[PDB]
Design a binder for this molecule. Sequence first.
Ligand SMILES: CC(=O)N[C@H]1[C@H]([C@H](O)[C@H](O)CO)O[C@@](O)(C(=O)O)C[C@@H]1O
Ligand SMILES: CC(=O)N[C@H]1[C@H]([C@H](O)[C@H](O)CO)O[C@@](O)(C(=O)O)C[C@@H]1O
Ligand SMILES: [Ca+2]
Ligand SMILES: [Ca+2]
Ligand SMILES: [Ca+2]
Ligand SMILES: [Ca+2]
Ligand SMILES: [Ca+2]
Ligand SMILES: [Ca+2]
Ligand SMILES: [Ca+2]
Ligand SMILES: [Cl-]
Ligand SMILES: [Cl-]
Ligand SMILES: [Cl-]
Ligand SMILES: [Cl-]
Ligand SMILES: [Cl-]
Ligand SMILES: [Cl-]
Ligand SMILES: [Cl-]
Ligand SMILES: [Cl-]
Ligand code: NA
Ligand code: NA
Lengths: 264, 264, 281, 281, 56, 56
Amino acid sequence: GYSDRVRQITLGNSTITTQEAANAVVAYGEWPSYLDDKEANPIDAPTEPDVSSNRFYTLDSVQWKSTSRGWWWKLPDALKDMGMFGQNMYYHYLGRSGYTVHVQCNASKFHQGALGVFAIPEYVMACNTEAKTSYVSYVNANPGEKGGVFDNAYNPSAEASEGRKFAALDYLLGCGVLAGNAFVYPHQIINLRTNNSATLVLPYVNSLAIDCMAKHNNWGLVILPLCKLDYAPNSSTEIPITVTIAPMFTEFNGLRNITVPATQ
Amino acid sequence: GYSDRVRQITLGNSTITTQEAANAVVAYGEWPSYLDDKEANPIDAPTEPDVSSNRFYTLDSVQWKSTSRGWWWKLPDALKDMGMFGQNMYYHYLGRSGYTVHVQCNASKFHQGALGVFAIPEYVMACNTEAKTSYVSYVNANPGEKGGVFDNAYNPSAEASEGRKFAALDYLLGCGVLAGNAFVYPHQIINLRTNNSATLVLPYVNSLAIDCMAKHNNWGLVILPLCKLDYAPNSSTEIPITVTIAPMFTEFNGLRNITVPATQ
Amino acid sequence: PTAQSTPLTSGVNSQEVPALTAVETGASGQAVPSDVIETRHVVNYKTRSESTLESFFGRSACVTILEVENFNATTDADRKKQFTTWAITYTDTVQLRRKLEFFTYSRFDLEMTFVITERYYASNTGHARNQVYQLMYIPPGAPRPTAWDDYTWQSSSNPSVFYTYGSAPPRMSIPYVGIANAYSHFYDGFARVPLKDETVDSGDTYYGLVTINDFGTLAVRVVNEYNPARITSKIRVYMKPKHVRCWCPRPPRAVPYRGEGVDFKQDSITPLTAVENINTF
Amino acid sequence: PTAQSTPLTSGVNSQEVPALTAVETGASGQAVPSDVIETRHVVNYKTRSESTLESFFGRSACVTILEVENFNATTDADRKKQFTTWAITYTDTVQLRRKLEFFTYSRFDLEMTFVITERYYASNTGHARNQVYQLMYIPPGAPRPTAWDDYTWQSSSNPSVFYTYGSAPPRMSIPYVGIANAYSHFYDGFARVPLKDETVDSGDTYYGLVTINDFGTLAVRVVNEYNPARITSKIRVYMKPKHVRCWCPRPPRAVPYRGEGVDFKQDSITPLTAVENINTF
Amino acid sequence: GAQVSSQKVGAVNYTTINYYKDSASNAASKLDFSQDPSKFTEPVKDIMIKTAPALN
Amino acid sequence: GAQVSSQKVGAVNYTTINYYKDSASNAASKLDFSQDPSKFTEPVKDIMIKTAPALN
Ligand SMILES: CC(=O)N[C@H]1[C@H]([C@H](O)[C@H](O)CO)O[C@@](O)(C(=O)O)C[C@@H]1O
Ligand SMILES: CC(=O)N[C@H]1[C@H]([C@H](O)[C@H](O)CO)O[C@@](O)(C(=O)O)C[C@@H]1O
Ligand SMILES: [Ca+2]
Ligand SMILES: [Ca+2]
Ligand SMILES: [Ca+2]
Ligand SMILES: [Ca+2]
Ligand SMILES: [Ca+2]
Ligand SMILES: [Ca+2]
Ligand SMILES: [Ca+2]
Ligand SMILES: [Cl-]
Ligand SMILES: [Cl-]
Ligand SMILES: [Cl-]
Ligand SMILES: [Cl-]
Ligand SMILES: [Cl-]
Ligand SMILES: [Cl-]
Ligand SMILES: [Cl-]
Ligand SMILES: [Cl-]
Ligand code: NA
Ligand code: NA
């Protein structure tokens, strides 16, 4: 009865079902966990918000078209305005979190296409001016739940002030490496003939036990069309991709007044 | 190998197969049985016709259209002219029977629609004149294998003599209760995307051990389109619904000359 | 016994999927909160005591209102006002009937209670001595009265209760008296089989329980002879099913009754009030 | 158990100083006579039996007076006099209310008793036969009568008591029926949260227990039809809390009530009578 | 022939004696907490395990 | 199921039988002499000994 294709995930007051999964990935074979006393750093008693924040948040959906070049988000950035997770994040200097990432994309037995879904630690991307290096604004680096898109062209700006955004060039993974090698990162593929969802469980990954969430994204989430969407009755059709992410084993230190980042 | 979707039922010289079932219902959790000595009433040695009568009889098929409002039959009425069951029924004053009801409706993976299939004890229906109450002719109450149909309008007769039939109003289940609550009765649903048949096994149900079959129907069988038939290439398409019913554990008392009911 | 307590549960990431089912099977949804959320432990001490059948039916309900009078009657019509007869039923009123009709069959003993009230018809005709009432149960076959003072009221075998005005409401128990093994609230059939070519009328025959039911008759009189002052009385009849069993549940009555059957009335078959939109909180 | 006996004590000359304290702590004074005088031994056999909560509340108190009449009503206003409805509460009167309001929360069963009285409206319209009353408890949601003889009085499920004039005052017990774990005598809050920019009226909304309390309705009628003589009746309703628990004591009401809330009236907020001087024996 | 039974709790026993020779005269039946919703909510021939697929 | 209890003395036992199936129907609760005035008269965190200084 039980199947690699059928799964339920419950976190807090939220549940996901899928009937066309393809197993699930646990990044680097490690489930998330709380921070042990023998690896701890800040000494204040941490806040562990548990069910208030460790639950599925669904981002705004994006549309997959035959011409789409792909999508990216950063974490914890994409969830910074999500319910109590966002509040706990911004009221504290320090935070750590794992995640369950559930990417959703159904179609029909007559559609075709394949999405690579990658979780990338320290997903540093190229800037869009050749007058400077590492020249990206905080606002452009941290788009929140809307994330960003890849392009198949690189057109760096005439003036440095206009190029302070990522050059998200698809085939170089926005960072000067070949996209065909992205499979070294934890990943699944949503191949429409096979499955309609990808599930990745991510431990906290960093060179520190805990860090400043508002300064530093631990993971990138990349969705790249490896094989373009095609549908014979209408090649211009679009199908939604929906991203739903739950923080897990969240832990926060250094409580004070709320952080309100710059918006422009 | 074995599956909730694949079933064989053999009674007497008759067998049914289905490859897209959805389990089977045993009404009120009780399989039919013969009448025990400690619950018996008439004292003559009963006739138990066994395989001659306890076998699948297939009624005339009906056509499901996008405009159909539903169908009803009564039991044992629907089987009164069926082989040796009918003969045993009419040669005796008294009879009891359980049933296996198998409703059949296949389509395609591109059709949609859902039929509620309900077995209703004492399915008393409203009459079609407001000049009288409980004013239904024997002939109209007992249509036999052709059964009857529901309507979505109630148009009671101008004169009492013309309204001596059921007002089979669909959303009131032909009896002044809301059809959405019919699920309190033993039932299955034939939802075309899921299954192509319904199977209900019915014990004898009455306030007596045994009764006059020619006077009294113990069960109603109701088939209501809960979601209309739709098929994109031809919205006017029709698909058959076929009803096949086997008496079970039949037992008859009070043998005499044959009952021949009025026909007009 | 109590209603269900809730166990402490966390989350899952599993091939076990209790949130999904297939109601085509005829099974209702079965999942409970612990299956689809993280739950705390809550001990449930609450019970379903008041929804047992005995509790649901454990009330004396008014089933009819009868009228009788006491005065010097000089016409046939006025003589017929000196006593009343009523075929025993629960269909004169709607409330108890609807509750019983959640079920197809039942078995119970009955407590019957009566409330008897009077008023003066007029004020210029003196007064009236305190009245005694006779309520006689006439089982099917026993002779029915044609006058308030005929021989039937001697009631040698029929049960009668003599009630004195102003005394406590009278009351008696009746056993389960059905000739079947349960009462039928619905009967999908007829009292006889009409046969081929018979000359018996088929145009004015009825259908269902009305063709087979007969629980006898209640006959009521004022035992006193007339005073100068005409007194008019009402007798309210109450029924409480007790020691109750029921079988085969049914959807409850959704639209007004229009008689003893299941028939409905054309101007009263629209119970739902339409909502403004499918998205109306 | 008895109140405290007094021990034999003499005097002291000591660094122990029970006469001094510091009530800033929130503690009341604790010293007793033996601490500050020479005392004899006195055995105290007296008990605090009559100040237990059960004893303090162990009385049937009148909480309202209802009126109903029986006559031939020909106008809407007069038809409405043939029955009465009353939202069940203890705030129509002041005495039981004030006693209950020594506490913030309570839990008790209720004994309800009724005293029913009549008088003739006039003397030139003959007489009236003895009347039977129906007192029907209508829980929240159940249909309320619009006429004295409408269908609601059949009372299949609502509890009703039928009372015959001149009989002993009728009486019944009611369990603790609160939907919380105790009754609240005071509720510092509202029934809903008004939200930012909503169009719901905020100018005519209320505050406190009145926004959340609902113990249903008592409906009363005379069951009899009209006599030539109009009869007017009063129904006094009595409540006795029994099996009582209470929590969180409060200062008692010091000034007149002016409604169901804690509000006070400008002409009645001077309870103390001024003394001539601070030195007035 | 007195029966002593537990009362329904309020905010603990009571006594009953039957006075009449017919059981129909008796007061209400004692609370019966029996139930089996599955005869109506799950009257299926083959057992359905919640955590399993309803159809396999 | 008769309960025999001490009466309140006058200027010595009595008998009670409960007739009803609901405890709400019962007569008054028996005298409960429980008390703990200190939860209102001395609800202090640190014990205060009368003979000692209230503040030291
Ligand atoms: C039932 C009814 O309405 N009775 C009324 C009678 C009758 O109408 C007449 O007496 C018949 O002629 O008249 C009264 O004025 C009366 O006698 O005092 C009032 C009384 O209530
Ligand atoms: C309530 C009341 O005051 N009723 C009084 C009536 C009415 O005022 C008139 O009958 C109405 O017209 O008058 C009386 O003289 C009477 O009838 O004997 C005295 C009686 O107490
Ligand atoms: Ca045989
Ligand atoms: Ca759970
Ligand atoms: Ca008489
Ligand atoms: Ca001393
Ligand atoms: Ca009246
Ligand atoms: Ca399941
Ligand atoms: Ca001191
Ligand atoms: Cl955001
Ligand atoms: Cl036929
Ligand atoms: Cl006589
Ligand atoms: Cl007489
Ligand atoms: Cl609406
Ligand atoms: Cl009534
Ligand atoms: Cl009357
Ligand atoms: Cl003074
Ligand atoms: Na429990
Ligand atoms: Na003492």
